[PDB]
């Protein structure tokens with residue numbers, strides 16, 4: 001594996017390509033509230049929908065702040081297109097920097113996210129234009145590789161993972177057409193099936209605190225090192241992505257929990273999940289929690305891993321329900337296939353395909369077999385979660 005081509009610093013153009021008549025490039029400043037609102041306005045009405053046009057992702061402004069101003073961020077990688085006359089923001093494409101491990105090679109990359117074009121400008125081949133411009137702005141900052149995730153199949157995916165969904169409020173989900181009433185059943189029965197204990201069971205479980213950063217950082221890195229493709233977390237990245245700052249973030253987006261051993265008081269496990277609503281195109285919102293990063297000391301010894309994950313993740317479900325989330329989403333990546341079925345996650349129609357730009361490596365297993373169902377012998381591949 002390795003880079004596909006070497007970029008000649010000397011030949012990177014200082015000026016962007018031309019755009020469709022009536023439109024112009026605009027760097028976004030997401031520290032400006034009005035511009036943050038503008039991006040929110042665009043995504044809210046024009047971002048990812050399901051195939052049935054029932055749901056649309058509704059990233060919050062707090063989520064956008066958190067996702068796009070992570071450690072090392074640069075406004076130059078928050079790319080917009082405006083209408084010249086009205087000034088309206090009509091397209092976007094964004095990146096943030098991070099380091100990844102691809103089979104034990106560390107790479108400096110940008111994660112690409114929030115590619116969006118206003119419905120009225122679709123199917124004009126603007127996308128390749130947006131991609132080329134953010135590529136140019138990255139090349140200018142000495143970054144020549146990218147990773148991204150997509151719901152559609154494009155050239156040479158590195159992996160594919162299937163979405164799974166654990167109902168927390170089944171009735172709400174049924175109500176908005178997310179979950180159906182199977183057939184011979186009743187609401188009462190579906191509610192019973194999905195009912196969850198009132199309290200967590202794992203001893204020492206508590207909300208992560210800033211004091212936990214160093215030891216969570218070390219445990220996470222050891223755990224993720226067990227995957228061919230993974231995110232190479234720095235200390236600042238643990239602070240940013242994992243510890244919610246209530247004093248400065250009124251709308252919480254990340255929940256993280258640690259298990260502090262009753263005896264050693266060392267943290268021995270942790271898990272986290274984030275808040276991403278969907279607008280119900282027509283109630284008006286599905287409040288979904290997504291599983292994010294987790295780690296357990298048990299990984300390093302088996303089959304105690306499955307057993308430990310069953311404990312932690314059922315606790316994660318309890319905590320999410322307690323925080324009023326409607327559903328708990330997870331993909332077949334990390335060691336997730338160990339617990340999805342047994343904790344009653346239902347298989348989803350959604351598939352997330354993973355891609356690298358300007359880097360060649362063999363395909364990596366995505367937690368499923370050729371039938372697109374979870375497989376314990378198909379893990380160890382994908383250890384990176386994108387938002």
Ligand SMILES: CCCCCCCCCCCCCC(=O)SCCNC(=O)CCNC(=O)[C@H](O)C(C)(C)COP(=O)(O)OP(=O)(O)OC[C@H]1O[C@@H](n2cnc3c(N)ncnc32)[C@H](O)[C@@H]1OP(=O)(O)O
Pocket residue numbers: 046047048049110112113114115116117118121122123124125126127128131134135138139143144145146148149150151152154357
């Ligand atoms: C070194 C640094 C490198 C940095 C860059 C690394 C590359 C990152 C790449 C971007 C990572 C994004 C990660 C995310 O954010 S995935 C999120 C994508 N956004 C959405 O799904 C929101 C809803 N949809 C839209 O806003 C539009 O439909 C979009 C913008 C998706 C397409 O607009 P439109 O429908 O009006 O099409 P077009 O006429 O302009 O262009 C048609 C071309 O676009 C290619 N296309 C379609 N969808 C995607 C897609 N999701 N990734 C990459 N390419 C895509 C398509 O194959 C076709 O090419 P092909 O040859 O026929 O021509």
Ligand SMILES: Cc1nn(C)c(C)c1NS(=O)(=O)c1c(Cl)cc(-c2ccnc(N3CCNCC3)c2)cc1Cl
Pocket residue numbers: 048049050051055056057149150151152163178278286329348349350351352386387
């Ligand atoms: C409730 C709901 N709301 N929306 C908008 C949808 C599609 C559903 N139904 S879903 O929950 O079962 C679901 C989910 Cl979560 C996610 C994807 C999916 C597929 C491909 N790509 C992405 N992303 C683009 C890149 N950034 C990461 C997310 C998401 C598809 C489905 Cl179908």
